[PDB]
């Protein structure tokens, strides 16, 4: 069982017999959400030395993240009011960016590799695009489903397999991230499990047994890239989707 690293264990506990209060209780998932919140709080509270203008070396990091997500959501929705949807496009980044660096620490735990939470967050953003689009643009919201000047005898086919791609968008956006984080962690644990039993046979294998160690180091080098790039790709697709929902093509 190489997948035991994702087990959810209850720690602080709470129960009753009147009402099902077992929904909220401090758990491994919940404790790592508390840790994510305290890290994100720590990146801005004690980072700023006594509210100085000059912005010490720690604040350049949270300066660059801010600027690379402003200049990304200005180039996507880019209309009359792009900044009204900027806090959500930033707080969808920082959760995924911090929750995929915390998960790299060896005896730790991936928030992002729970499909039930990430798929739920994706369905929340998809319904919050459809409701916002219907509210802002009435019955002509469905004009999104015809591409451009197209010949009329093939328009209903191009409507059906446009709407099918419109509600595949509900689960695709989440399952991309879930699949990347889950496959990366499962790859690292399985190769560690193979190189461990590689190094317990006869003593000639601990000699020149440095090359599988170097391969695992190279995969860990790759895994930060595949963890930060997904945190960026989430925040670019849910900027493009707000471009479609707010502005009709």
């Amino acid at each position: 069982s190489p997948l035991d690293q994702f087990e959810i264990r209850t720690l602080f506990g709470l129960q009753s017999s009147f009402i099902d209060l077992s929904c909220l209780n401090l758990t491994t998932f919940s404790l790592y959400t508390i840790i994510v919140l305290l890290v994100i709080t720590s990146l801005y509270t004690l980072t700023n030395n006594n509210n100085k203008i000059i912005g010490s070396r720690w604040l350049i990091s949270q300066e660059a993240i801010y600027d690379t997500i402003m200049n990304m959501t200005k180039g996507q929705i880019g209309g009359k009011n792009w900044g009204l949807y900027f806090p959500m496009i930033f707080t969808l980044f920082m959760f995924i960016f911090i929750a995929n660096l915390i998960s790299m620490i060896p005896y730790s735990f991936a928030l992002s590799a729970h499909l039930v939470f990430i798929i739920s967050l994706s369905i929340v953003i998809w319904l919050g695009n459809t409701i916002l689009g219907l509210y802002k643009h009435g019955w002509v919201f469905f004009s999104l489903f015809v591409p451009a000047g197209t010949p009329l005898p093939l328009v209903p086919l191009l409507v059906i397999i446009e709407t099918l791609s419109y509600f595949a968008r509900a689960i695709s956006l989440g399952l991309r991230l879930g699949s990347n984080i889950l496959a990366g962690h499962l790859l690292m644990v399985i190769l560690a499990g193979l190189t461990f039993n590689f190094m317990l046979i006869n003593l000639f294998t601990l000699v020149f047994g440095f090359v599988p160690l170097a391969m695992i180091l190279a995969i860990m080098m790759l895994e930060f890239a595949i963890g930060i790039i997904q945190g960026y790709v989430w925040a670019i697709l849910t900027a493009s989707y707000l471009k479609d929902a707010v502005y009709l093509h």
């Binding site: 469905f142 004009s143 015809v146 009329l152 328009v155 409507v159 709407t163």
Partner: peptide, 24 residues
Amino acid sequence: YHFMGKAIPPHQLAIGTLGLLGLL
């Protein structure tokens, strides 16, 4: 901005196909 049978130019046509496949 289509023109079906020289009638009034239809709105976007997208709702009617969904309504046809809805009742099935």
